[model samples]
Target: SNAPVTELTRLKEYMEDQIAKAKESSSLTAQLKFLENAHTEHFVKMGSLTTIYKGGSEVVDRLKIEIRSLYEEMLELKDKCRDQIQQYET
Candidate 1:
C-alpha cells in the first residue's frame, strides 16, 4: 500500500537532497542562490498544504526551521558568488 504525496512531504525530500548537495559542493554559490528561492517557494506550498490538512503541524514546524536555515546559508553563499563574479568582471 502507498500513502499520499503531500506538498510538504515532497518538498521536504527535495530540500533535503538539495541541502545535502549544497553541503558537499565546493562551488555551489550560484546553485545555493537558486535553491534559496526554490526553498521559499516550497515553504509557501507546504504552508498551504498544511492549512488544508489540519494535522500537519509537525511537518510544518520542521519545514519552517529547515527552510530558514537553508535561506540563511544560501544568502551567505549567494553573496560569495556575487563577489566572485564582480572580481572576475573587473
Candidate 2:
C-alpha cells in the first residue's frame, strides 16, 4: 500500500510540472502573435512612406534600411519562441 501511494505521488508531481510548462508555452504563443502583428504593421507603414517619398532624400533610404533590420530581428524572435513551444510539447 505504501509503495502504491508513493508511485501515485510521483505521478501527480510529474503532471503538475507538465501543466506549468503548458501554461508557459501558451504565454509564449500569445507574445509571438503580438510581435507578428506589430512587425507587419511597421513594415507596411514604412513601405508606404518610402513609396510616397519616392527618393525624396537620404532620410527615407535610411529609414527603410532600419525597418528591414528590425523586421529581421522580429522574425528571429518568432522562431526562437516556436522552438521553445515545440520543446514543451515534445
Candidate 3:
C-alpha cells in the first residue's frame, strides 16, 4: 500500500498549517485574516483533516472579496478627494 501522504494531503496541510506562515507575508495577509476569522469563529483551528481538504476547493474566494473590496473603496475615496480638491480650488 502507498503511504498516507497523497496529492491532496500536501495541499490540505498547506491550507491548515501553512496559513500561519502565510499570515506573515504582506500580500498574503488577506488570506491570513480570512482563514483565521473562520477558524476562530467556528473552531477552524484544526478540525478534520478531511474536512479541510473538502473545503479548500477554490478555498480562497471570500478573502479576495472583502480585502479587494477594501482596496477598491480606498481607491474610490482618494479619487473623490482629488476630484473635490481640484474642482473646489478653481
Candidate 4:
C-alpha cells in the first residue's frame, strides 16, 4: 500500500515480537532449571558424587556447564531487550 503507518503501530509489532521471544525464553529457562534440579536430585545427590556413576558425574558437569552458559546468555539477551525497550520509552 502507498499509505504509511506511524511509529506506534510499528512499535506495537516490535513489542509483540519481544513478548513472543520472552515467552519462549521463559519456557527455555524453566526447562533448564528442571534439568539442573533433575541432575542434582537424581544422579548427583547432595554431599558428594559418591552416589553418581562415573560417566554421569562427567555428564552432569557438562550439563551444568551448558545450562549455566545458556542461562547467562538468555539473561543477557532479555536484559538487552528490555534495555532497548527502555530506550524506546524515552
TM for every model, in the order presented, reads 0.54, 0.56, 0.32, 0.38
State the lDDT of candidate 4 residue by residue for 1-90, as single tens digits.
211122223323443444445556645455444434433333222223333324434545554455445445545655665676688789
Winner by lDDT: 1
Query: What is the Cα-based lDDT of residue 52 in candidate 4?
Result: 36
Q: Is candidate 2 or candidate 3 better by TM-score?
A: 2
lDDT (Cα, 0-100) at 26 in candidate 2: 52
Candidate 4: count of backbone clashes, pairs at least 3 residues apart or interchain: 0
What C-alpha lDDT, on a 0 to 100 scale, does residue 24 get in candidate 1? 68
| CA shift of 86, model 1, Å | 1.1
lDDT against true structure, model 3: 0.41
Which lDDT tens digits does candidate 2 get at residues 35-68? 6565556555554553345454555455456556
Estimate every model's Cα lDDT from 0 to 1: 0.62, 0.54, 0.41, 0.44
Runs off by more than 4 Å, candidate 1: 1-5, 22-56
Q: Residue 69's C-alpha lDDT in candidate 2?
A: 60
- Model 1: per-residue Cα lDDT over 32-56, one tens digit each: 6556756677667755664465445
Q: What is the lDDT of residue 88 in candidate 3?
A: 65
- Using TM-score as the yardstick, the better of models 3 and 4 is 4
Off by over 4 Å in 3: 1-60
